Symmetry: D4
Subunit: 160 residues, 8 copies
């Protein structure tokens, strides 16, 4: 029914990356919303979004951005909810700028940061799932199945 995870990203160009988070949440049947919120171009949209997230029923926010990537950290500044950050791969610096601007948060306002790129987007959704599983037993069983299938499906030898 109502969303319990919010996926937000700074622009349409981030979607090629953040779609992997959206797909994973859908696979695990976690109700969620998927939105564009720009820290730099729509800062008041971000303030309102982050400030009202908990009262709207959201439990986790997944935020993706690239370059001087401020969206996850500023989201965390306005909410007590856990915020997970996805560094989007940038053209010149390959997401090293994205990674350092997200992960290096000063003490007092955390962002749980995942890998650069599609791997990070997928893992932010899995981390959000593991958080919700702590108090949602049906989901916890679906997550167990997901992790079991991942493990069991790894081949024993490479194909030529």
């Amino acid at each position: 029914s109502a969303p319990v995870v919010g996926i937000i990203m700074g622009s349409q160009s981030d979607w090629e990356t953040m779609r992997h988070a959206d797909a994973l949440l859908t696979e695990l049947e976690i109700p969620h919303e998927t939105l564009i919120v720009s820290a730099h171009r729509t800062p008041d949209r971000l303030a309102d979004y982050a400030r009202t997230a908990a009262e709207r029923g959201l439990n986790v926010i997944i935020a993706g951005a690239g370059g001087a990537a401020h969206l996850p950290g500023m989201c965390a500044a306005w909410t007590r909810l856990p915020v997970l950050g996805v560094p989007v791969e940038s053209r010149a610096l390959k997401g090293m700028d994205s990674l350092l601007s997200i992960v290096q948060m000063p003490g007092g306002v955390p962002v749980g940061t995942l890998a650069i790129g599609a791997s990070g987007a997928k893992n932010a959704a899995l981390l959000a799932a593991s958080i919700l599983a702590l108090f949602n037993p049906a989901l916890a069983a679906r997550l167990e199945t997901w992790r079991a299938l991942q493990t069991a499906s790894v081949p024993n030898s490479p194909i030529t």
Copy 2:
């Protein structure tokens, strides 16, 4: 008073950093355990710790390591719980080796990674608190009070005197 968070680290030299996570959980009245588990010197200890964490009642694991920092990632391989990683600052490469070896987990096994050093340890505890707050209303109120106080405590101007 059974532990609901586990703080683990590879060596005593990590404690100077990880003590900041311990202090913050205690401040917020979150029961927890603090242990040494070496990914490289005690790999079977790690396997056992991680695979039994959920049945022992743990809800979050905070793992710190430096250099080729494998403890958070291998912990996450064996548990379904959320694992949070603290890159401990290293001597030569200033924690850049720690950071990359923790945060760059391939898709499928997450570690939620915090800043290099003491800031990251403090933030791993706050992030764990924000997770537990989702289903613990008393802790949720303590955390809001804590965040509100942090905000109200920021000075308006610097002390500019010579």
Copy 3:
């Protein structure tokens, strides 16, 4: 004597760096204000400071921050004024995290970024002065005199004695 430049920083620990901007504006007789505004601990304070800056008569904002340094960029998001950013040197990564998180603004919202540390703070004040000089002839003459003196003051040879 109303302020025409605003110097802002996230914490008292930034003052050791940002004091160099303050000193240079005073030397050039540019009225200014100096404040602590934390992007992460006081985000509503930042929104209010930045959105009202122009109507309060400010012409330039100089913002310093370190680590995941978001203060200059978020200030620029809310003001139409020019924002100049000073990367404060950080402990582990020597200001490389500060530099990249300030200078790499996506197209649409600029921050004019200066060098890591004290040199950058001094240069943010000089750059602000060069901006204001475009429409303040008395300050323009003070700035030319200052630049001329800097040039004339460079020694011709090093002191080479043992």
Copy 4:
């Protein structure tokens, strides 16, 4: 009429990047000149250009270069005008060489530095606009409109 911003770049290969600065100034109707000036191959051209910029009526210089990128800093050495620097993306090091050789100016001679690549070129033009807006009210209103349109135009959700 007469130019009030000068866009200079070290070579024709920089134009793919610096054209974004030229386009933005034209969009905001800021009269400007767009020139090739090489710090390394035409150093006397650079000295003359920078030394006479103010007396020619220029108010801001935008300078782009790549690699060991000296054009912005040497321009600033010869003028009291504000100089804004655009690090052009280099082939091997992806503009990290460009960025460090522009931004790390010693105290006493500033260059306001923007992002590596096309984003930086666009933002140098916007920063030049915000500088001129301080004493040109018609332009200040056009810049307000530009920033308002940027903010209002951000979509609320990504397209698949």
Copy 5:
């Protein structure tokens, strides 16, 4: 007959790199096994593999992985055999993450690390060969021939 070197890699995507190790061992007629073992997705498979390697008759393990690359180091944690590590080139960070997560092992558990990418995979196989040559004289002669041919085959001038 029975394998004396084990080549292991974290996923099928590593094979484009690790095939160069497999080819070299085959060229030198060193019996070996070539397997997928994931540190993160199949950690119990890894524990069993590394713990039993010596008793199965393996003498050297070559382990390849990318990103947060833990496979070589965790393999070394469970075996007294020499473990050689190949950093696989990652998409964003070009194997710098792979290299630092493999080479920077703390004192007490070594991994002999080779270059990022195909060069490293080839050299891990050559290093494994030089190790086995110490107590296998027929192989030592084949390795001498291999190195002699490499040296003799280098042209004296480039082709246009």
Copy 6:
């Protein structure tokens, strides 16, 4: 008691690092020699050392160097023996120049590279030991005992007192 491992380094300043390899080989009762060989100042000494190593009875070479660190790679060019490289930490670039100039050998001439600094020197000796253990059963038993003791010696919890 003839040497079966050769430890070589470019200068006396490398000894503070390479002494950790020497100590570990002695602990495990592995006879060895320790020498200064400069790739850049004594290139003919290096050629002779490396090309005669196998006929002199050496089985493994451990080579340390810093900066533009060419000693391990050029040693490997002249010997068929396994060569293990230790990146010595450098002043400005913290051993990153040492690391890249040793580990990034093009295909055809291997150097097995260990961590920057003292950890790498210790691990080069342990790796050499694991190589020799493959055909020396007494040493194999000493090495297993050593690794077992390392594992059993890891404490279960940190010393957390103030």
Copy 7:
């Protein structure tokens, strides 16, 4: 007639880069030889080449290599002649490994290092030319002409 500059490179794959040095020397009519010499695969060829260079009449050596790039430094170890180093762009690390392994020579054995890639190869040839011009007046005049033409040929404005 007889060569006065030697261009050497570690492999055929370096030629795409080092051909720019060869072309420049030919343009300035500087007699030279262009050879493959591998530090790692033909170390005795390198020793002989560098040791006999001066007595063969060579005045400058230009040496190019990539990755763990040892060719320039080891050449300098065996000759009193000036050795100029060209870092060849490597696949993963984009010549940062090449650059640091060439430029960071300890005191006592120098290598004059140029930029990563084709720019460096061209500039090594120009630097070799400026060295020879010091005692060859006809060449000094040709180099003056070359530099004058470079300066005069820079356009004043970019082409669209």
Copy 8:
């Protein structure tokens, strides 16, 4: 005794590094001059110094600078002489900014670049000596003697005592 090499640097703070070039030229009896020329604070001084160097009888220029290090490159823009660049170590970025801003000259205007710091300064003087030796037989013999002595002076083993 007219100078045939010019050593130039941007500030007195560079002398701690550039003094190593001065000492080595004096040791090899190469007459030279040592001056401060700031690319950014005295750009016309630099233009004049560089464009007149050859007619004044200089054969090689050794230029040191740190940070955004433009002095060697701009010197080379104005002279046809060989210019050798010394990256002076910087506080935050350890000379990596100095190194990249000197070595990465686009094709057409060379700077022969040496190592970061004192080693680079010493090697710039040795490289200048090797250039001048090509047409100065007495200096050629002094340089060979110097290189031979360096080689013969390398010890055969480290001092390994505790």
